């Protein structure tokens, strides 16, 4: 298996979402993350102390990780960090960032309104975080000056002061990745009359957000511990470790690095141009050139399908695969990797129906019976029968494939020199074949019903179709015009229980969909049961006797 750990095994009780403070990123970081090069210690195949593993995770599959010491299957990633030459918008929060600037004073960092307005103090009292932020924003977006003096809440003749700063508040519009402002001005109290027109820099917006009061920002959706607004801005870039962006390495003399490894490479490069560009003779525009460029890659690394035009594309044309893109579902981590999975111990094949199977069983092809395994624990109850199957072998039918010793180590009866002189011990596991009356999950997709997956008794049989009782045909929606069906096989004593006790075919007969039975006699048997029971229809002794015996219960009378 995966190895033993002394650490206490618990379950997740709460997931607490938040934002990375840079400091934390610097803190978890097992490396920066300095050089765009993947590896090749100058051409020499082996990672570079610079991108992937300057301590991070591991490539190689021999050669264990250089921080934990554990090697692929065990070692998760380990995070790195790149120090950004300039602050940059997290693409996801440009949205929110803008709206916050609209709420607070873009010079001093006081909230634009407070308990001195009434609607404000009324929005302030809104219990719901998210809703209140919206309620506040619509109020504050209008206020175009950081007002110093307010009509008091007893009489508007004596004006009480609140916070300082006079300064007009810019009207802000997004110009895709850039936030730009427009201040009313004055000039003989006119203006505008052409207003002032400059672009809000990250660094300034950043500083404003920093100055935003703990109580203030807390009234906006935020949290002084887990997500401060300043953290919507990136200065330290967490670098995901190889297992997130693994080099799919065909043969040996050919890398094949992952799309993200490239996008990072770009980010890295773009960062170095900017860093040397300002540390050198800064032509003050070639700086804001590379600024924008960095902001772009760090944008399109998280989201590449952005509204504002261009689509950061791999040389080839194929656009780069944003992390966002990996997640948007039906295929894609959440929906297609988590809410659903491809699974072990499963099988599928053409179905056909059987007049001779019992309702709640399913005919399984011997071939599949021999592939599909159940992990059975060696016990005095089964010890001889179990030994019989093992000696019996894996190519035989009722046999076994692997024996699993106490030492969590796996014995392959297909090869193991000791596959004959194999002597079972209480507490080991024999993974044996699927056998008659093993409870299994049968399922015909699409699966819109409870009844679309039901537990059946196995009956191992010849030929290559799953055979099922004709009457269970309808709750599956199945017809033998070539439709295949999936079968899953439980592995725990617990799970078979769940199957046989909750979702066995017989249970599913009368159904809550409509307080009536959801399967009945159909097709031939139906067409025939009519013909059988006419007044006209009589039956001679010879036949009657067979019909009786055929009923497998018959009192013999």
């Amino acid at each position: 298996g995966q190895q033993y750990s002394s650490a206490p095994l618990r379950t997740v009780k709460e997931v607490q979402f938040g934002l990375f403070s840079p400091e934390e990123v610097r803190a978890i970081s097992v490396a920066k993350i300095r050089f765009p090069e993947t590896m090749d210690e100058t051409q020499t195949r082996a990672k570079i102390g610079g991108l992937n593993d300057p301590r991070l995770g591991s490539i190689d599959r021999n050669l264990k990780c250089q921080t934990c010491q554990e090697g692929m299957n065990e070692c998760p990633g380990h995070f790195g960090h790149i120090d950004l030459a300039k602050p940059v918008f997290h693409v996801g929060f440009i949205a929110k960032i803008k709206k916050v600037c609209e709420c607070v004073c873009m010079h001093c960092g006081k909230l634009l309104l407070d308990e001195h307005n009434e609607l404000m103090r009324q929005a302030l009292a809104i219990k719901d975080s998210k809703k209140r932020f919206a309620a506040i924003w619509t109020l504050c977006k209008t206020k175009m000056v950081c007002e110093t003096d307010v009509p008091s809440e007893d009489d508007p003749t004596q004006l009480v002061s609140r916070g300082g700063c006079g300064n007009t508040q810019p009207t802000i519009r997004k110009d895709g990745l850039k936030l730009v402002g427009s201040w009313k001005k004055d000039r003989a109290t006119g203006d505008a009359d052409e207003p002032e027109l400059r672009v809000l820099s990250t660094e300034e917006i950043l500083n404003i957000f920093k100055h935003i009061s703990v109580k203030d920002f807390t009234s906006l959706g935020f949290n002084e511990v887990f997500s401060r607004p300043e953290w919507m801005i990136l200065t330290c870039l967490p670098v995901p470790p190889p297992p997130v962006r693994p080099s799919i390495s065909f043969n040996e003399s050919q890398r094949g690095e992952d799309d993200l490894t490239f996008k990072l490479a770009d980010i890295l490069k773009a960062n170095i141009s900017l860093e040397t560009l300002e540390h050198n003779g800064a032509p003050h525009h070639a700086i804001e050139e590379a600024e924008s460029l960095l902001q772009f890659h760090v944008a399109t690394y998280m989201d590449n399908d952005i509204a504002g035009q261009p689509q950061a594309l791999q040389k080839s044309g194929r656009p780069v695969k944003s992390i966002r893109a990996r997640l948007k579902g039906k295929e894609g981590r959440i929906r297609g990797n988590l809410m659903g999975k491809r699974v072990d111990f499963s099988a599928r094949t053409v179905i056909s129906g059987d007049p001779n199977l019992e309702l709640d069983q399913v005919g399984v092809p011997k071939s599949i019976a021999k592939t599909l395994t159940y992990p059975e624990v060696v016990t005095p109850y089964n010890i001889d029968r179990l030994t019989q199957l093992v000696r019996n072998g894996p190519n035989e039918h009722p046999g076994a494939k692997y024996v699993i010793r106490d030492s969590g180590d796996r014995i392959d009866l297909r090869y193991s020199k000791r596959a004959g002189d194999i002597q079972l011990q209480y507490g080991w596991k024999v993974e044996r074949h699927i056998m008659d009356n093993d409870p299994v999950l049968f399922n015909r997709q699409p699966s819109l019903h409870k009844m679309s997956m039901m537990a059946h008794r196995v009956k191992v049989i010849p030929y290559s179709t799953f055979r099922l009782n004709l009457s269970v045909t309808s709750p599956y929606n199945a017809d033998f015009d070539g439709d295949e069906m999936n079968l899953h096989v439980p592995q725990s004593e617990e799970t078979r229980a769940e199957l046989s006790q909750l979702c066995a075919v017989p249970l599913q007969i009368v159904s809550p969909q409509s307080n009536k039975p959801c399967m009945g006699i159909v097709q031939d048997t139906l067409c025939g049961i009519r013909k059988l029971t006419l007044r006209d229809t009589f039956i001679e002794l010879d036949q009657v006797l067979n019909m009786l015996y055929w009923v497998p219960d018959w009192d013999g009378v």
Binding site: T11, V12, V15, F17, L19, I334
Partner: protein, 112 residues
């Protein structure tokens, strides 16, 4: 209340026009769900899926990344009471069979 009434009525009619019968309880539940909020809540991306259920939960329908982004920026805390959360987490859910806990009683283990 009367809204709920009509809402059921119209839903019943969609089903019953096709001829089929569906037990009252199921339509009632759906209808009740749309309603308990305070008025009509769309069974859609921006209707039910915008309530204050678990971040992780809601994120498993329509607005995935956008949701998680918001989840972090507002520091949402997921209860993990939801089915889907446990499904994501590989935990047995509080669902039927998991709706309750099982203990050994040392006492009775000695009585027998």
């Amino acid at each position: 209340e009367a809204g709920r009434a009509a809402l059921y009525k119209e839903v019943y009619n969609v089903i019953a026009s096709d001829g089929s019968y569906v037990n009252y309880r199921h339509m009632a539940l759906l209808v009740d769900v749309m309603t308990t909020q305070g008025g009509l809540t769309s069974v859609t991306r921006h209707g039910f899926n915008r309530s204050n259920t678990g971040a992780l939960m809601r994120c498993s329908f329509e607005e995935t990344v956008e949701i998680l982004f918001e989840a972090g920026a507002s520091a949402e805390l997921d209860d993990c009471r939801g089915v889907s959360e446990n499904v994501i987490l590989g935990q047995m859910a509080p669902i039927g069979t998991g709706a309750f806990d099982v203990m050994i009683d040392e006492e009775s283990l000695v009585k027998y």
